[PDB]
């Protein structure tokens, strides 16, 4: 289960950093 949840943590991280732009 964590396998899927892990993807969300790492993926959700990139999204947050993406917003940082500008």
Swiss-Prot record:
Pfam families in the record: Antimicrobial12
Query: Which BP terms from GO are recorded?
Result: defense response to bacterium; innate immune response; killing of cells of another organism; regulation of defense response to virus
This protein's GO cellular component annotations are:
extracellular region; membrane
The modified positions for Glycine amide read 22
Q: In which tissues is it expressed?
A: Mast cells in gill, skin and gut, and in lining blood vessels in the viscera.
Cell location: Secreted; Membrane
Entry keywords, A to Z: Amidation, Antibiotic, Antimicrobial, Antiviral protein, Cytolysis, Hemolysis, Immunity, Innate immunity, Lipid-binding, Membrane, Secreted
One molecular function GO term is: lipid binding
- How does the UniProt record describe the way this protein sits in the membrane? Peripheral membrane protein
Concerning InterPro entries, the annotation shows: Antimicrobial12
Q: What is its main location?
A: secreted
Q: What is this protein for, i.e. what is its function?
A: Antimicrobial peptide with broad-spectrum activity against Gram-positive and Gram-negative bacteria. Rapidly inactivates both channel catfish herpesvirus (ED(50)=11 uM) and frog virus 3 (ED(50)=16 uM) over a wide temperature range. Has hemolytic activity.
The UniProt family comment states: Belongs to the pleurocidin family.
Q: What is this protein called?
A: Piscidin-3
Origin organism is Morone chrysops x Morone saxatilis (White bass x Striped bass)
């Amino acid at each position: 289960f964590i396998h899927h949840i892990f993807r969300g943590i790492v993926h959700a991280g990139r999204s947050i950093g993406r917003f940082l732009t500008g």
